[PDB]
Assembly symmetry: C2
Homo-oligomer: 307 residues x 2
């Protein structure tokens, strides 16, 4: 059936307890929802972020930094998160598929995503990475050669550059796996940031949503699934103008966008990615909803289109 | 041509400088040798160990251990090394292929290898992991609930259980990739140690040689390449009996074996793996030589056979 690229959130995987067990445990539930789509005859093309995971790992790299045990640069850290999270997800999916009696194979592929070295993002570190720190701790680490930004309500986090995806090196192999009916997990953590023909690794963390967006293109998927904690995109939330979006046209999204309805932090990137995907090919669509909502399915939430 | 499973050593990748750069740099040279085999029309099925890489990572896990940033258990650590080392190797191969004008695709697949929970290895930690420590530091860490073993000449290292491979979960996917002429990198770090139908992760590190041996079986490769720092196996080295084996029979190796010639720490596993492979199928062969020697090629060193 429909080829769907689902982008799992790293902050969702690690929304509370930061222990491997807790994260794997969380992935069991998400896998249950994913397998549900498989029961419906859809083709799953899974991806995932790594925000908190990579930050914690980066800290671990710094904690023992020495000649004998040197810290692995961010690009290499992303690769490690592809391994860890990949492992967890794949194990979870297998468990759920096995239980559901469905016999599909799952494979995670290390993905190197090319980016433009002249990307403005390299000047503007924005990707919130790791745990929340007090302004005090933020200062303590800030002077070590790092930039932090505040999230009103919980604290400060280290910000990193998030360049836009230009090309997915392993795209061909991924596509081949898809053609052989294998559930693929790729573009882990937005993909290992790489630049140039030599694919020189750079220090950054790409946004899962935009990486998934490119994958959807190169893979010619039918739908791009952007995850959110709530089903339906709300506008003017606490205000008396509260409205769900349900069925929307790209033009309609642009209207709301121009009217500053989407927060630059989370919602804006979601909308932009959605719009970009739909505008890439004639018969394509983007969906924005809760994974739990997909676990139910019938007539789903937020469908961005133009045709 | 011949399908060859080559097992790269983690200690070879990290033989000196422990920095990501130094290791990647080392992988460029190895990639050159590997690409040479491709020029000869051979099919490459690459694998690799992670001994030093995983130990350093494990230490990093311990250095920041806390509720907010907990240590990832060994199984998850192996997964991370599959990601890091995989990334490095894939990147390097790409570079060398591109340079050599050869257009082949390279893909690393996260591999979960099944083992027997009742394996004697779980009682006998043997796999040397991480850096060399003085007996003093060994004692300091030993009482933390860890076992260490000495290597006369350089120091002590933390030992971990090395259960034998029973099955490779992603074998089917790997084989598919091979049939599509894609250079696969799998069984990273001997593979993520897993147990049972549920694939419950266990704390251990599988030997690359034995993992590659299983891969060779399930993949039906023509030859298993076991790497050594030297071309040709030399029994009675510095003695007046120094002899090269060149071409040998399993029986002959078993005879040389009984005489306790091959050191249990390195050479013994090499020989055992080779013998086991050749004895699995009628027209199979195992090779033991330097990667640099393969980089030359013609009439290669140490060919174990029986047919």
């Amino acid at each position: 059936g429909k080829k769907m690229v689902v982008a799992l959130g790293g902050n969702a995987i690690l929304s509370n307890d930061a222990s491997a067990h807790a994260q794997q445990q969380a992935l069991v539930q998400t896998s249950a929802y994913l397998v549900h789509l498989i029961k419906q005859g859809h083709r799953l093309i899974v991806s995932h972020g790594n925000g908190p995971q990579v930050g914690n790992l980066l800290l671990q790299q710094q904690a023992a930094d020495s000649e004998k045990n040197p810290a692995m640069p961010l690009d290499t850290c992303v690769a490690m998160t592809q391994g860890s999270i990949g492992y967890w997800l794949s194990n979870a999916l297998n468990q759920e598929l096995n239980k559901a009696g469905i016999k599909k194979q799952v494979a995670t592929v290390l993905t190197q995503v090319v980016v433009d070295p002249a990307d403005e993002a390299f000047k503007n570190p924005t990707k919130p990475i790791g745990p929340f720190l007090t302004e005090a701790e933020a200062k303590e680490a800030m002077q070590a050669g790092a930039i932090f930004k505040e999230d009103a309500g919980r604290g400060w986090r280290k910000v990193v550059p998030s360049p836009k995806p230009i090309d997915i090196h392993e795209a061909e192999t991924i596509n081949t796996l898809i053609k052989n009916d294998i559930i693929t997990i790729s573009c882990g953590g937005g993909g290992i940031p790489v630049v140039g023909q030599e694919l020189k690794g750079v220090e950054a963390v790409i946004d899962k949503d935009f990486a998934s967006e490119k994958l959807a293109e190169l893979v010619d998927a039918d739908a791009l699934v952007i995850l959110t904690g709530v089903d339906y995109v709300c506008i003017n939330y606490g205000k008396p103008d509260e409205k769900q979006l349900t069925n929307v046209t790209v033009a309609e999204l642009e209207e709301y966008k121009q009217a500053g309805h989407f927060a630059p932090g989370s919602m804006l990137p979601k909308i932009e990615a959605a719009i970009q995907f739909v505008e890439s090919q004639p018969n394509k669509q983007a969906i924005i909803t809760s994974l739990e909502n997909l676990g139910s399915m019938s007539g789903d939430e937020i469908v961005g289109t133009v045709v």
